[PDB]
Design a protein around this ligand. Structure first.
Ligand SMILES: *[C@@](C)(CO)[C@](*)(O)[C@H](CC(C)C)NC(=O)[C@H](Cc1ccccc1)NC(=O)[C@H](CC(C)C)NC(=O)[C@H](CCc1ccccc1)NC(=O)CN1CCOCC1
Ligand SMILES: *[C@@](C)(CO)[C@](*)(O)[C@H](CC(C)C)NC(=O)[C@H](Cc1ccccc1)NC(=O)[C@H](CC(C)C)NC(=O)[C@H](CCc1ccccc1)NC(=O)CN1CCOCC1
Ligand SMILES: *[C@@](C)(CO)[C@](*)(O)[C@H](CC(C)C)NC(=O)[C@H](Cc1ccccc1)NC(=O)[C@H](CC(C)C)NC(=O)[C@H](CCc1ccccc1)NC(=O)CN1CCOCC1
Ligand SMILES: [Cl-]
Ligand SMILES: [Mg+2]
Ligand SMILES: [Mg+2]
Ligand SMILES: [Mg+2]
Ligand SMILES: [Mg+2]
Lengths: 125, 195, 204, 196, 212, 222, 222, 233, 195
């Protein structure tokens, strides 16, 4: 297997690969989250250099993880699908073993844990 | 686990499943629901080996629910039944097979038709107007052959179902403690509380 | 399906100073199910006492059979049968069914009316006589009784002391056996008086 | 066991080892497997010790009763009585018997009776578990009309090898000589026959 | 064994005996067949002693890890399901367990789950498990009402075990009582059948089959 | 077919006092009707004032003891030479036994020592790891002979106060080390008489706060 | 069991241990395995206890009737023949393994009989579970032309080998000497090398310890 | 799961005042067939240990090789291989006992019964048994197979307990061993007359005796034995 | 054949016997009387192997009736029970034993006492205040241990019996189709038609 340590420390104490991943997020379309008294609203930018788009079938920016939780994102679109898939599987796995849907904190903690695992695993960025 | 029945009528599918859970010489429970909702318009009843039944049903349920979230779309009863059959078909040649027999009652929203599938633990799928698993069939099939009509209403189907339960209660050796009846139609799944 | 351990029960017999004691539990069951707490396993034919453990139908059958034989013995001999003689009768009768035996563990106890000697004996299911000075044990808790009797017993006990020893041997053996217990009876036998005592034991 | 019977010029000689086993334990190391059913009709016993004894006892009874009525029986007649018992009770017996006797008319005769209860008249016969190891030797070395001394050496050398290779055989080598002269018992100990 | 646990107006009663057998040999009369998992959770033990004892202490470790990770006490449903999913992995290997996971939580209320070694997991109000379960059911069912007081409920649970301890040969020793409330579980003592039988016989006037 | 198990006979006995505990066991080792050894110890000092015996199939018993002894050694290495308490040892042994749940050690295990309050402790195990603390326990071939005698003499079962109409029980009390050794010796001599696998010698290990002492007594050799 | 038989100058001697088992449990610590068939024909028995006693009593009865009928003292070969034919008829189901010995007008004799009906002749024999231990002694120390006192010593030594080394054998040594021209002498408990040591404690209970529910006088008289 | 094919019978041994004696016949049986007659079942390890092995001979030859390799391995990077860090009987035994138990635990045993006899560096006698099940025990006398039933009783008459060991000389001990071998030849159907005997003494060291024979046997009384009961001729 | 119960009260013996006759997966009959009158004051209920039960019961009945005619006298319940036990005790060592368990309820006119005997197929006789055969005992015995009193009336006994049947109907796996109840007292034998 490909083992290379891609995410590593630099002399100044930075992990450039993680910081360059943030630059990819900074490039991505803007996404905003605002929570009210009895609701949360997820706003998302869609760049208008793309005309002739088919908005019916184009992947939506906001994704349902379960019937009660949603996930929006900024950065690499292809990468987001992998996190969303893992989150959706974990959501059903939680209902199966705990007989209760995930809390938003738990789901976030899981997704965050996946992202972290890719910052100190060999062969991955 | 013993008695599970299914009757497809004009506009709905009706599933009746016994309430008794027996272990040894003791009826441990008399209010057991031997069914899981796979999707808003698809219901699966089950019967067979202890432990395997619920483990299998919930495993299927989780997979169908995962699909629904991923595609934001409900799978057709036919698609669900094929998925379930394949899982049982894999299972039968495993190290330890699922010894579970199922009925899948669903309402196809695209076709606007009720659909009843009978699948045994070997992965033997058949679409039927009425179905049963276990010894129940040996009484109900002949009874339904006689009294069943394809254009029946949901209410007529319930009366037809009452006739089956009465016959089973008369001639079956074991006390199965009545049945939970559920109806699957265009408006989804609901339970008949007084049967 | 082991005939000797379906119904359960125990019998124990001890000698003392010019006396003998024989005791038994009162349980009759069907494997795990306890059915009767009044099933006595000790019988007597004149002054000779017989305790029988094992399969309850054979216990009842042998009692009726030895009553039959001792009643005829007495009519012809014009005297009551003695323990030594009865012991040989039990052995004969059991070995007569050598290849289709009664599933029992009988125990004879009594005092010879002529010599005054205390006498006890035990048998296996096919009639082998096990004569003993000290004690005889029988039943589903025979291992337990062997351990209790071998440690508690001492020779030449008086009737009142012998009563305590045999009772404690039975009770504590019975409490370590699932198929024995549910009451107990002890017979104290002197040359010309016999006392029968029901013991208080745990009813589980 | 290892047993044999050999006809020769003057009559017949029976031979046998002396080992009786219960598994690998030797219950008797000085057994006498050569048994008299009549004055000059003997047999070699192999198989079950209980069965062969019970049979030989019945045969001895039959030939004693035969003699009281009809005089001395033939060796063939003795073999027939053995066969009758071994054949009719073949389902309940484990007996491999060699019958050997001396008539004045017929001289030395040997009949072997295997498990099934069949009868086979032969010049010489070998039987028992240890006989398997000496089929080759006995076939190569046997000759008809041997002398007494030659026949004794033949049996001695044969059973020596049988004993050597077979764990179920051993002890002493007993022999019984049947001639017109009479009945002679012979014995040979390990120290002699082992180093042959 | 005989073990039971039932749900009622005032929470949950849990009662078990303390005998251990190796065939007809009475090995122990002082076995703890209730495992204290946490202040709001109990587990009854029937079948294989080691299997029950080992996996139910393991269950408590898993319930502890849950509340560390989630900063919240585990539900009775989730606790029972950890055990049921565990034994299901070993299905066919020969585990012998007949357990009952009893407890209280805010969201669930008082809850009992029956869990056995062949994978069965049932929620219910009344359960009796063990070789003397039928004897316990007989007394318990015939005297059970939802509106039982805490005092009467404790006695019924105790009396039901006594009934089984008496008739079933492989049941006996002593009765261990527990009461589970919204505040947690409460131990209500160890009661030897040796003394309890006669006490109950005299006071209640029952057990007339027995020579008094 | 190869049978991996065997029965080496013997019997063991553990009694707990107030400030001491004993673990006794006969020294006879057998197979079928043969005697292998008249003196083959099966009660061991395992360190940290814990004595242990695994009676039944000797090969499994020796392996278990060997493993527990090794567990004690590593407990010191990993936890700054902390003393392994008797309750901690018991739980550790459960995991050793249950680790082979599907190919068990054919042994009845008993350990003895002092608890953390200084009081006598005896723990007994089944072949697959179920354990319980007790005042009294006999294990092995003659356990059925010895155990009911211990119930009567150690725990005073079925003994009532004279004249009280069987209403007042004989009160429980701790026994002295002298009285306990008497019960041990009488238990084993009785067992030797009536059980063929028991005899030759008796080795008792006594555990107090001062350490582990040994005592040996001859038994009938028939 | 261990039983032996040894021939000597002017007769024959047989011996036996006194243990009776019921599995691993010693049922009788002092049972008599030496049986009288006739006054001067005695029998040592091993195997199924009831079978050895029943078969020895039956043949002994028929030997007595035969002796009365023929006006002659019974012969050992008659008992031997009657026993083996009886045992053979039952195809080993009567588990009696006997050493038959005695003196008669023909001389002194020593035989063994096995359950299936086979008989053996010898100067020294041993049967039972301890026969190998006994035969090892007999093979080591036996010689031709033994005296009465030498044979008794050899026989009892052979039984002792079984007592000590075989778990199936134990307790005491019984002997019976059958010499020509003399009455047979049955030496019950010739050796008693397994006496129970004094117990450490008396377990005599205080009167009133046992709880009683009822008392009643039993009527044994007419 | 195995079944033994070519087998070796009893191995007998005992302790005496200065050391240990061990013996075993030179036979390799093939069921009831006494197939091989030149089989050495006593294997010396160094000048202070002898391993006697009964049971399956193919597994015995495997063990020989292991012991042979053990000596080679112990000599590696070991300047004191012929002195302080030489192989002890207790080391050799524990190794074998570990192997035997590991093999039985894998349900593929070495179908043997082994007796390791030797003298330790401090002069102490070593005598311990181990078999296919991994069962181990020690005693003043040890024997396998029929030897356990027939030899032990005879050897225990000489050394009945620990205190009898100092009282037993090498002459007396060897005499008892040789006598026991004769008794086994009389009574064990899978035994041979030829055998090997080894003495490990703390003073005189290892003395390995080959090509011994059972002698002074009693067979003469056989001539008087006629029939099986009644027969007079 | 499955459920037979017996309760001896102050002045009568009450026998309750299930009505179901099941063969395979079919309840062939739901009104079977599993009892025979042996004499005017003696009643025997029975349960066990098919065929054997009735064959045995009627054989006993004929023998007791023969005795009654011969002596112009009714045998006591104790005498009848001893006779029945001996027949079963002979049977168990026969080539093919009767696999029948019985309860004998009788009123002894000489003693003026009700008597209940429980005899199993081995010939194991016991006199009891209350008795049962088969799995019934595993529920009823503990229930009767609790609620039974020796001085109860016939009406109290019937209520006590109703409590047993209810418990069996709740916890028994098989449907035994209720029970036929019969009372034996000083006035003979009569049947309770509404239970
Ligand atoms: C050689 C040994 C083989 O051909 C000889 O043929 C000799 C013949 C002489 C003695 C007449 N045969 C025997 O020694 C004979 C071998 C034998 C064994 C079993 C069946 C047939 C032949 N040995 C015996 O007959 C012994 C004699 C006893 C020791 C006095 N008997 C037994 O071994 C009996 C056999 C019972 C039996 C079983 C099946 C058919 C016939 C008889 N067995 C036992 O006593 C119990 N034994 C315990 C160990 O497990 C096996 C049985
Ligand atoms: C009631 C009391 C009886 O059913 C309960 O159901 C209890 C549950 C309580 C104790 C937790 N169950 C038992 O007491 C249970 C019954 C049982 C026995 C065997 C297998 C399954 C269930 N008893 C045990 O588990 C005992 C506990 C002992 C007394 C400490 N253990 C054994 O019987 C052990 C181990 C059994 C076992 C299970 C699985 C794999 C291997 C073994 N076995 C022995 O002790 C064997 N034997 C005893 C006699 O001494 C020689 C060896
Ligand atoms: C040594 C000790 C062993 O070889 C001796 O050979 C002695 C010989 C003397 C005593 C005659 N043998 C025995 O002691 C003998 C050994 C034995 C055991 C079992 C079968 C064969 C041989 N012991 C017995 O015969 C005892 C004697 C009792 C204790 C007085 N009998 C039993 O153990 C009986 C066996 C009966 C039997 C029936 C059918 C075929 C063979 C034997 N066993 C029981 O009673 C067991 N159990 C007890 C409870 O009731 C149900 C049966
Ligand atoms: Cl022979
Ligand atoms: Mg009890
Ligand atoms: Mg040979
Ligand atoms: Mg009980
Ligand atoms: Mg002993």
């Amino acid at each position: 297997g490909y083992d290379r340590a891609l995410s590593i420390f630099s002399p100044d104490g930075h992990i450039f690969q993680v910081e360059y991943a943030l630059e990819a997020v900074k490039r991505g379309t803007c996404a905003v989250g605002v929570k009210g008294k009895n609701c949360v609203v997820l706003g998302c930018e869609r760049r208008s250099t793309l005309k002739l788009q088919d908005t019916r079938i184009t992947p939506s920016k906001v994704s349902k993880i379960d019937s009660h939780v949603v996930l929006s994102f900024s950065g690499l679109n292809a990468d987001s699908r992998i996190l969303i898939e893992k989150a959706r599987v974990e959501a059903q796995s939680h209902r199966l073993t705990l007989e209760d849907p995930v809390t938003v904190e738990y789901l976030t903690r899981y997704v965050a844990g996946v992202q972290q695992r890719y910052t100190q695993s060999g062969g991955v960025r | 686990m013993d008695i599970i029945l299914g009757i497809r009528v004009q506009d709905s599918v009706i599933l009746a499943s016994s309430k008794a859970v027996t272990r040894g010489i003791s009826v441990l429970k008399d209010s057991d629901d031997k069914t899981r909702q796979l999707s808003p318009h698809t219901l699966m009843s089950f019967a067979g080996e202890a432990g395997d039944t619920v483990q299998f049903a919930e495993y299927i349920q989780a997979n169908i629910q995962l699909y629904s979230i991923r595609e934001d779309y409900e799978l057709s009863p036919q698609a669900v039944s094929s998925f379930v059959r394949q899982e049982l078909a894999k299972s039968i040649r495993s190290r330890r097979p699922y010894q579970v027999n199922v009925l899948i009652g669903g309402y196809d929203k695209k076709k606007n038709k009720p659909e009843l599938y009978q699948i045994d633990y070997l992965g033997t799928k058949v679409e039927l107007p009425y179905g049963a698993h276990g010894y129940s069939g040996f009484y109900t099939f002949s009874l339904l052959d006689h009294h069943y009509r394809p254009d029946m209403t949901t209410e007529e189907g319930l009366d037809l179902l009452k006739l089956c339960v009465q016959e089973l209660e008369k001639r079956m050796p074991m006390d199965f403690k009545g049945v939970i009846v559920k109806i699957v139609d265009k408006d989804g799944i609901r339970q008949v509380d007084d049967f | 399906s082991d005939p000797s351990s379906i119904n359960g029960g125990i019998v124990v017999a001890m000698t003392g100073k010019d006396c003998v004691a024989i005791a038994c539990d009162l349980r009759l069951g069907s494997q795990s199910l306890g059915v009767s707490n009044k099933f006595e396993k000790i019988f007597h034919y004149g002054h000779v006492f017989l305790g029988i453990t094992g399969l309850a139908t054979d216990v009842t059958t042998l009692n009726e059979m030895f009553r039959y034989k001792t009643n005829l013995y007495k009519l012809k001999e014009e005297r009551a049968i003695e323990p030594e003689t009865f012991t040989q009768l039990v052995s004969s009768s059991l070995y007569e069914r050598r290849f289709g035996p009664y599933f029992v563990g009988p125990v004879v106890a009594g005092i010879n009316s002529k010599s005054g000697k205390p006498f006890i004996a035990g048998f296996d299911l096919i009639g082998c006589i096990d004569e003993a000075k000290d004690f005889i044990v029988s039943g589903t808790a025979s291992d337990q009784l062997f351990g209790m009797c071998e440690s508690l017993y001492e020779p030449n006990l008086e009737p009142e002391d012998l009563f305590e020893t045999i009772s404690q041997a039975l009770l504590n053996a019975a409490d370590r056996d699932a198929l024995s217990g549910w009451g107990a009876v002890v017979y104290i036998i002197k040359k010309d008086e016999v006392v029968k005592r029901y013991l208080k034991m745990r009813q589980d | 066991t290892s047993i044999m019977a050999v006809t020769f010029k003057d009559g017949v000689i029976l031979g046998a080892d002396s080992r009786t086993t219960t598994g690998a334990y030797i219950a008797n190391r000085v057994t006498d497997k050569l048994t008299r059913v009549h004055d000059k009709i003997w047999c070699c016993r192999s198989g079950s010790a209980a069965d062969t004894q019970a049979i030989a006892d019945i045969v001895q009874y039959h030939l004693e009763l035969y003699t009281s009525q009809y005089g001395t029986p033939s060796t063939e007649t003795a073999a027939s009585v053995f066969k009758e018992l071994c054949y009719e009770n073949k389902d309940n017996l484990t007996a491999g018997i060699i019958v050997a006797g001396y008539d004045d008319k017929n001289k030395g005769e040997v009949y072997t009776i295997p498990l099934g209860g069949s009868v086979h008249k032969l010049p010489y016969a070998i039987a028992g578990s240890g006989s398997t190891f000496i089929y080759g030797y006995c076939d190569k070395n046997f000759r008809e009309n041997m002398s007494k001394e030659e026949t004794v050496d033949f049996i001695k050398h044969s059973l020596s090898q049988a004993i050597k290779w077979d764990g179920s055989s051993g002890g002493v080598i007993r022999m019984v000589v049947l001639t017109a002269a009479g009945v002679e018992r012979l014995i040979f100990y390990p120290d002699e026959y082992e180093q042959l | 064994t005989t073990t039971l646990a039932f749900r009622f107006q005032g929470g949950i009663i849990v009662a078990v005996n303390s005998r251990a057998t190796a065939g007809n040999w009475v090995a122990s009369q002082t076995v703890k067949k209730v495992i204290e998992i946490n202040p709001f959770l109990l587990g009854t033990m029937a079948g294989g002693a080691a299997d029950c004892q080992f996996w139910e202490t393991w269950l408590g470790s898993q319930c502890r890890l849950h509340e560390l990770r989630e900063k919240e006490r585990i539900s009775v449903a989730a606790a029972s399901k950890i055990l049921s999913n565990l034994v299901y992995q070993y299905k066919g290997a020969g585990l012998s367990m007949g357990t009952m996971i009893c407890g209280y939580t805010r969201k669930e209320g008082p809850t009992i789950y029956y869990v056995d070694s062949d994978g069965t997991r049932l929620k219910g109000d009344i359960f009796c498990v063990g070789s003397g379960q039928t004897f316990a059911y007989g007394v318990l069912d015939s005297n059970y009402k939802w509106d039982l007081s805490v005092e009467d409920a404790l006695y019924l649970g105790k009396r039901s075990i006594l009934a089984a301890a008496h008739r079933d040969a492989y049941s006996g020793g002593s009765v261990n009582l527990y009461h589970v409330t919204e505040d947690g579980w409460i131990y209500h003592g160890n009661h030897d059948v040796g003394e309890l039988f006669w006490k109950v016989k005299e006071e209640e006037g029952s057990f007339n089959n027995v020579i008094g | 077919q190869f049978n991996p198990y065997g029965d080496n006979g013997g019997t063991i006995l553990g009694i707990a006092g107030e400030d001491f505990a004993v673990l006794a066991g006969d020294t006879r080792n057998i197979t079928d009707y043969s005697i292998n050894s008249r003196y083959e110890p099966k009660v061991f000092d395992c360190g940290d004032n814990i004595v242990m015996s695994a009676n039944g199939f000797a090969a499994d018993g020796d392996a278990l003891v060997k493993r527990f002894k090794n567990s004690v050694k590593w407990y010191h290495f990993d936890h700054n030479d902390k003393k392994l308490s008797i309750n901690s040892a018991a739980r550790n042994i459960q995991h050793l036994l249950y680790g082979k749940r599907f190919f068990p050690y054919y042994v009845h295990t008993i350990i003895a020592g002092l608890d953390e309050d200084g009081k006598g402790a005896v723990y007994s195990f089944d072949p697959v790891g179920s354990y319980e603390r007790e005042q009294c326990r006999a294990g092995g071939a003659a356990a059925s002979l010895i155990m009911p005698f211990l119930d009567n003499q150690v725990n005073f079962k079925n003994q009532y106060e004279p004249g009280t109409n069987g209403k007042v029980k004989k009160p429980l009390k701790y026994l002295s080390v002298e009285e306990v050794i008497k019960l041990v010796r009488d238990s084993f001599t009785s067992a030797t008489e009536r059980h063929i696998q028991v005899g030759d010698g008796l080795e008792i290990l006594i555990v107090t706060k001062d350490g582990v002492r040994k005592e040996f007594y001859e038994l009938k050799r028939d | 069991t261990t039983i032996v038989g040894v021939k000597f100058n002017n007769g024959v001697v047989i011996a036996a241990d006194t243990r009776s088992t019921q599995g691993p449990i010693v049922a009788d610590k002092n049972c008599a395995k030496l049986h009288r068939i006739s006054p001067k024909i005695w029998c040592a028995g091993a195997g199924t206890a009831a079978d050895t006693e029943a078969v020895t009593q039956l043949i002994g009865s028929n030997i007595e009737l035969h002796s009365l009928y023929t006006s002659r003292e019974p012969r050992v070969v008659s008992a031997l023949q009657m026993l083996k034919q009886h045992l053979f008829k039952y195809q080993g189901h009567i588990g009696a393994y006997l050493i038959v010995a005695g003196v008669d007008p023909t001389g002194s004799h020593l035989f063994s009989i096995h359950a299936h009906g086979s008989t053996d002749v010898g100067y020294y024999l041993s049967l039972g579970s301890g026969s190998l231990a006994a035969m090892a002694v007999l093979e080591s120390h036996w010689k031709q032309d033994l005296t009465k006192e030498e044979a008794i010593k050899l026989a009892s030594d052979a039984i002792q080998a079984g007592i000590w080394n075989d778990l199936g054998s134990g307790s005491n040594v019984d002997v019976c000497v059958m010499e020509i021209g003399k009455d047979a002498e049955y030496l019950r408990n010739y050796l008693t090398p397994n006496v129970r040591e004094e117990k450490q404690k008396s377990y005599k209970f205080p009167r009133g310890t046992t709880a009683v529910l009822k008392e009643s006088i039993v009527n044994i008289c007419d | 799961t195995q079944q033994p094919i070519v087998t070796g019978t009893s191995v007998i041994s005992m302790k005496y005042d200065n050391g240990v004696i061990i013996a075993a016949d030179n036979l390799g049986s093939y069921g009831s067939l006494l197939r091989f007659n030149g089989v050495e079942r006593l294997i010396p390890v160094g000048d202070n240990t002898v391993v006697g092995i009964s049971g399956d001979i193919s597994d015995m030859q495997h063990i020989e090789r292991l012991l042979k390799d053990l000596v080679t391995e112990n000599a590696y990077d070991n300047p004191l291989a012929d002195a302080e860090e030489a192989l002890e009987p207790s080391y050799i035994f524990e190794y074998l006992a570990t192997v035997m138990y590991q093999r039985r635990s894998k349900m593929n045993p070495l179908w043997n019964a082994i007796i390791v006899a030797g003298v330790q560096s401090n002069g102490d006698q070593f005598l311990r048994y181990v078999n296919l099940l991994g069962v181990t025990y020690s005693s003043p006398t040890l024997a396998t197979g029929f030897g356990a039933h027939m030899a032990n009783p005879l050897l225990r008459k000489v050394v009945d307990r620990e205190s009898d060991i100092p009282k037993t000389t090498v002459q007396v001990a060897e005499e008892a061993i040789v006598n026991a071998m004769r008794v086994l030849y009389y009574r064990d159907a899978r035994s041979s007359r030829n055998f090997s005997l080894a003495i490990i003494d703390k003073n005189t060291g290892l003395t390995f005796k080959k090509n011994l024979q059972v002698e002074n046997m009693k067979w003469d009384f056989a001539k008087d034995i006629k029939g099986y009961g009644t027969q007079k001729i």
